[PDB]
Amino acid sequence: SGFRKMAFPSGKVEGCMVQVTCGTTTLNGLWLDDVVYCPRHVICTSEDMLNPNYEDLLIRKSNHNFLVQAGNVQLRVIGHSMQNCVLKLKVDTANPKTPKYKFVRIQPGQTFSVLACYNGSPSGVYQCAMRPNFTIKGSFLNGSCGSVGFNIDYDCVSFCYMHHMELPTGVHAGTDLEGNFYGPFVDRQTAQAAGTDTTITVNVLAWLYAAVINGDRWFLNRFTTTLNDFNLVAMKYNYEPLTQDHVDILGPLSAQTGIAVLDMCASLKELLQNGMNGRTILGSALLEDEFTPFDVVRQCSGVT
């Protein structure tokens, strides 16, 4: 009973967080095996920020300029390299707390947990979605760069995001763990257009199934729709067009509840066209899109 915006347990990631200082700037690093990963802008100063020449700035740095501290203990840096927008600092000691892990590039519309950190110390954990336009709407202040996003499958942490930037709009941008930005963004202090965003339709449908499972059923109706008809409504309301691949991933939820996907689409269509009429669904007064079908199945079945 109940449905919450649940994050993965953060302990495995907490054991990987370190502080990285280069010159003036301190941000977070991720220590896995004998490598510390961090955003490359740790090597910048204020005059560099409008458009840093990262290759030249890094040429001025030596291994001993990267101060890496794992809580109390200092790590000895024996190599450094820049890969896309991340720095990889080779250290002489493997992290004893390295969990089983993978680096993955997530798709827009997928969700993950963020462990927000400052000075290598964890502050809090929250769940969010990668928007269809590749931005994230997080909670990050100065010093949070290098905090990571991740998912967990049994004892394996799949790292998918490293935080690099707050755009002038207050929205967030970052990279995969190979330093490739999600979206069109570059690590410099400039206004940068984020694409037109959309609402993640398959996630809203998954959340309506979570609602029915938990007893919030007022939005169920006597109607059905088709993919074509629903997609005309999705177009009007700036929702992602629904495909058979999305219908297929909703199969487990349709099977559990007995509510055909297109019948749930007809509920969503009515909610888009009429609003909530001052009512709530799972404690929300809007249509929630930060739960994937996998998240709903996991939370509704108690996966550990």
Ligand X SMILES: Cc1ccncc1NC(=O)CN1CCCCC1
Q: What gap in Å lies between CA 189 and CA 203, rounded to an integer?
A: 33
Is residue 264 helix, strand or coil? helix
Return the range that interacts with a second copy (CB under 8 A); candidates 31-39, 77-85, 101-109, 111-119.
111-119
Q: What gap in Å lies between CA 124 and CA 6, rounded to an integer?
A: 13
Check binding of 151 to a second copy (CB under 8 A). Answer: no
Catalytic residue among 16, 22, 38, 41: 41
Contact 159, 147 (CB under 8 A): no
Return the range that interacts with ligand X (CB under 6 A); candidates 71-79, 88-96, 139-147, 197-205.
139-147
Q: What gap in Å lies between CA 106 and CA 59, rounded to an integer?
A: 32
* Token output for 159: 């790292």
Compute the least distance from the CB of residue 260 to ligand X, in Å: 28
Q: What gap in Å lies between CA 282 and CA 251, rounded to an integer?
A: 21
Q: What are phi and psi of 136, to 5 degrees?
A: -125, 145
The site map against a second copy for 12-41 (x = CB under 8 A) is: x-xx--------------------------
Q: Is 145 a catalytic residue?
A: yes
Q: Is 41 a catalytic residue?
A: yes
Q: Which residue has the tokens 């559990």?
A: 256
Q: Which residue has the tokens 């066209």?
A: 273
Kindly tell me which of 86 and 262 has the beta carbon lying closer to ligand X: 86
Catalytic residue among 128, 145, 160, 265: 145
Geometric angle at alpha carbon 131, from 126 and 137, rounded to 5°: 45
Report the partner that residue 122 touches, choosing among a second copy, ligand X, none (CB closer than 5 to 8 A by kind).
a second copy
Compute the least distance from the CB of residue 262 to a second copy, in Å: 26
Q: What gap in Å lies between CA 192 and CA 201, rounded to an integer?
A: 26
Residues of this chain that interact with ligand X (CB under 6 A) are: 1, 41, 49, 140-142, 144-145, 164-166, 187-189
Residues with catalytic function:
41, 145
Residues of this chain that interact with a second copy (CB under 8 A) are: 1-12, 14-15, 115-119, 121-126, 128, 137-144, 166, 170-172, 214-215, 275-276, 278, 280, 283-286, 298-304
